[PDB]
């Protein structure tokens, strides 16, 4: 019954910045994870709340595919109960996550010479991020007790910082494309399971 549009997500020309992670709904298809492989050298495929071996014998009300890019030393922060800049400011996953993440290196395809400024991450925020929340406001974040009326300068920085991806970066500093599939199931007809 049709194949899930995993190409449109994994083969996508450009991934959104982590602070504006995309969200594509996938339903009314069959998840054939066999074809997912042989697409770059994956760096992580770890699933919580569901045994991968039986992934083909169960399906859900729907699944949400959130795609973004982060540096390797940061990918470990994409997991329930984790802490870090990404975990508290950009992308936060609930402790009861029912789904799992996929990460693969994209250095050869997503690291321009001299710095790729197309990708930004939120480095400052007043408070942590609630699970599955999106923030895109670029208001000037004051740090001290001196209001700056929205002017960049001393003790008042621009919240977003661009990732300086370069070919000569560290082994783990190179960009990593991350796609998180959140399997959401309720008392509704199932939508996305592969061959029995």
């Amino acid at each position, epitope marked *: 019954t049709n194949l899930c549009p995993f190409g449109e997500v994994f083969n996508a020309t450009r991934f959104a910045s982590v602070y504006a992670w995309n969200r594509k709904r996938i339903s009314n298809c069959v998840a054939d994870y066999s074809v997912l492989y042989n697409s770059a050298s994956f760096s992580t495929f770890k699933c919580y709340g569901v045994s991968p071996t039986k992934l083909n014998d169960l399906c859900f009300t729907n699944v949400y595919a959130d795609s973004f890019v982060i540096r390797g030393d940061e990918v470990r922060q994409i997991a329930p109960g984790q802490t870090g800049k990404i975990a508290d400011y950009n992308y936060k996953l609930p402790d009861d996550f029912t789904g799992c993440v996929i990460a693969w290196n994209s250095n*050869n*395809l997503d*690291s*321009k*010479v*001299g*710095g*790729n*400024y197309n990708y930004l991450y939120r480095l400052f925020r007043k408070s942590n991020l609630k699970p599955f929340e999106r923030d895109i406001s670029t208001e000037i974040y004051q740090a001290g007790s001196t209001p700056c009326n929205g002017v960049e300068g001393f003790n008042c920085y621009f919240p977003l910082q661009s990732y300086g991806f370069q*070919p*000569t970066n560290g082994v783990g500093y190179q960009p990593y494309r991350v796609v998180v599939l959140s399997f959401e199931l309720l008392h509704a007809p199932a939508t996305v399971c592969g061959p029995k």
Partner: antibody
Amino acid sequence: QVQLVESGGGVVQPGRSLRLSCAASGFTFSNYAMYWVRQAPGKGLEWVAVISYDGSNKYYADSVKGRFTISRDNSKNTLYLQMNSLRTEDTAVYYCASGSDYGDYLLVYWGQGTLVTVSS
Amino acid sequence: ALTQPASVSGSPGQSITISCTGTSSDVGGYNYVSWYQQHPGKAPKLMIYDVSKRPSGVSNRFSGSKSGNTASLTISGLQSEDEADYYCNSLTSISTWVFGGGTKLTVLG
């Protein structure tokens, strides 16, 4: 296919200006970093210059530091190399490489490239 | 720069190896080498993408490999039409794209 055409330049006197233009088509020029690579007649290749995908950062080989200037304009999809204070040793054929998808640190397309002769 | 053999010769059919070496910064620490084949009077075109890979459309015979500080190309069943110059590239620190030098392949015709 992807085309890259160099304006070229005839024999010029040593220590005189010269503008070379590489015009590209068939791919997203404004999304990749071009390179200029020289080859002396009968010798091996030698990287000359590179410019970032938006012109913010430019890098030059030590041999041409402080004399060349690489720029680009995405409005008309062209790349320019300005040469000042030429030297006799500098005669060579210039290739305008692209660094296409699945690699930006490496040179891929290598348009036909023109010839520049520096003799008095 | 990098060091390469001045010339390599070989009859058609067998395996031919071409090796280039540099300091740790050029290739010993960075696995970004990529080799180009330039025919006489022609624009060089990529042959081995990355340390060991090949762009779509190139011959399957060519195969790149890396041994510690050295990088080598292996050609299986090379034909007469494979007679051309071969350069090994490498991305070093602070940019500075070094180049292999020169290596000519000939067939005992």
